[PDB]
Amino acid sequence: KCFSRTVLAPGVVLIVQQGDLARLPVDVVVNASNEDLKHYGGLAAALSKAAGPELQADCDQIVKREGRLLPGNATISKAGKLPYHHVIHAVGPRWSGYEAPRCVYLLRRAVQLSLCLAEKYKYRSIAIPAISSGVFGFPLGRCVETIVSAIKENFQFKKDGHCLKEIYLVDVSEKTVEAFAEAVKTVFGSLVSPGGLQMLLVKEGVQNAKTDVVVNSVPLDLVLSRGPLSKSLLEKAGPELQEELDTVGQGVAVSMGTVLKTSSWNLDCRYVLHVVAPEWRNGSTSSLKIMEDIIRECMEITESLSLKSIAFPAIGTGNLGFPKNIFAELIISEVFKFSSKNQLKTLQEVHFLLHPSDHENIQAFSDEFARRAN
Ligand SMILES: Nc1ncnc2c1ncn2[C@@H]1O[C@H](COP(=O)(O)OP(=O)(O)O)[C@@H](O)[C@H]1O
Numbered sequence: 001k002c003f004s005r006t007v008l009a010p011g012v013v014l015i016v017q018q019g020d021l022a023r024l025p026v027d028v029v030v031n032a033s034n035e036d037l038k039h040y041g042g043l044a045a046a047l048s049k050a051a052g053p054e055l056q057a058d059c060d061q062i063v064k065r066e067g068r069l070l071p072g073n074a075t076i077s078k079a080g081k082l083p084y085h086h087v088i089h090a091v092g093p094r095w096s097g098y099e100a101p102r103c104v105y106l107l108r109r110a111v112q113l114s115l116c117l118a119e120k121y122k123y124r125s126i127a128i129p130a131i132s133s134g135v136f137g138f139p140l141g142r143c144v145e146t147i148v149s150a151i152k153e154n155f156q157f158k159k160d161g162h163c164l165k166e167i168y169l170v171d172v173s174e175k176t177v178e179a180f181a182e183a184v185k186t187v188f189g190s191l192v193s194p195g196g197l198q199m200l201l202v203k204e205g206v207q208n209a210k211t212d213v214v215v216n217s218v219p220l221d222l223v224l225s226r227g228p229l230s231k232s233l234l235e236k237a238g239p240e241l242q243e244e245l246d247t248v249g250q251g252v253a254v255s256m257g258t259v260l261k262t263s264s265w266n267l268d269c270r271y272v273l274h275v276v277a278p279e280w281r282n283g284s285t286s287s288l289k290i291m292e293d294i295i296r297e298c299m300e301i302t303e304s305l306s307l308k309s310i311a312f313p314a315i316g317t318g319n320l321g322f323p324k325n326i327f328a329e330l331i332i333s334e335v336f337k338f339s340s341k342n343q344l345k346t347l348q349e350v351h352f353l354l355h356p357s358d359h360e361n362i363q364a365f366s367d368e369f370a371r372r373a374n
Pocket residue numbers: 032033041042043044045046092129130131132133134135136137138171172173176
């Protein structure tokens with residue numbers, strides 16, 4: 001029973017509909033899951049029953065191979081006896097009123113990651129439930145608004161190269177469907193955190209940063225001449241930047257998440273923190289958590305050094321393949337989370353340094369600054 005159909009873009013329709021996820025005319029469905037991909041409750045239990053034991057069995061193997069998932073994650077499995085070849089498992093957050101904006105961030109991310117997986121498998125149609133609104137306690141209104149916003153951003157941020165043509169928003173309950181239909185109706189340069197830490201969008205080369213600390217993205221072997229970000233810093237710094245990094249790196253088993261500190265030489269800052277950022281890897285649990293850990297660590301270092309400001313470029317969004325909107329939203333959320341749960345003595349400003357030519361990054365950050373400021 002269809003409640004509304006809304007044309008998003010040429011060839012793309014959003015359909016709000018009462019129905020059962022186990023039985024819909026789509027290529028793939030998104031299951032509302034948990035960290036262990038264990039389908040003991042809610043919609044997941046109904047899906048699992050209709051699928052038979054293959055679904056849980058393949059999920060157990062995925063968790064065994066890649067480890068447990070975290071909130072705001074998604075993965076894909078086999079579908080057993082469902083009328084689909086795969087099921088996408090979204091892990092929404094467990095709701096807390098004390099952490100509402102972070103929960104919003106994590107639900108949105110699980111949806112964005114699920115869409116990405118669908119587009120990677122070239123699917124044309126997907127059904128999506130009110131993830132987190134059952135056992136995980138997310139207030140129904142905010143939940144559906146968040147899911148619908150994620151979908152709008154999916155087609156609005158990058159308009160090119162989408163395979164998806166039908167998106168179904170579904171639940172067995174008439175009340176949840178009406179919430180979805182209402183959400184659809186409604187949806188279609190400086191920030192400051194509660195603790196006082198301020199975020200600035202700065203449109204220039206990171207080699208022109210005038211913060212205490214500047215963040216660089218480097219590969220495993222610490223060579224600074226290979227990515228356009230490090231190369232820009234190396235050219236403005238002088239070759240002693242390379243020699244000092246190699247020196248401070250001696251004896252380090254460098255890996256994803258390694259952060260090494262050097263002086264600035266010809267740069268206008270006091271220190272450079274060189275980070276080894278993860279590959280996107282289809283938005284894996286590790287890729288997202290490690291990037292967040294890196295961002296938190298650079299801030300903690302700046303605080304521990306009694307300094308006031310740090311400049312981040314859009315690390316991970318070139319060679320390493322992080323979608324730029326997803327990254328911007330990740331670093332912004334992380335800065336709010338850290339700022340909110342910590343009493344900072346000296347750290348007061350975070351600058352996002354975006355290259356003048358990088359219009360996609362500028363739009364990513366501007367869009368999120370706008371959502372946050374409203
Ligand atoms: N057995 C079921 N059959 C159909 N829908 C269900 C069933 N159990 C829960 N739901 C609905 O699925 C949606 C998601 O809830 P749930 O499965 O608990 O996911 P979550 O843990 O992420 O909140 C909610 O609308 C919930 O009412």
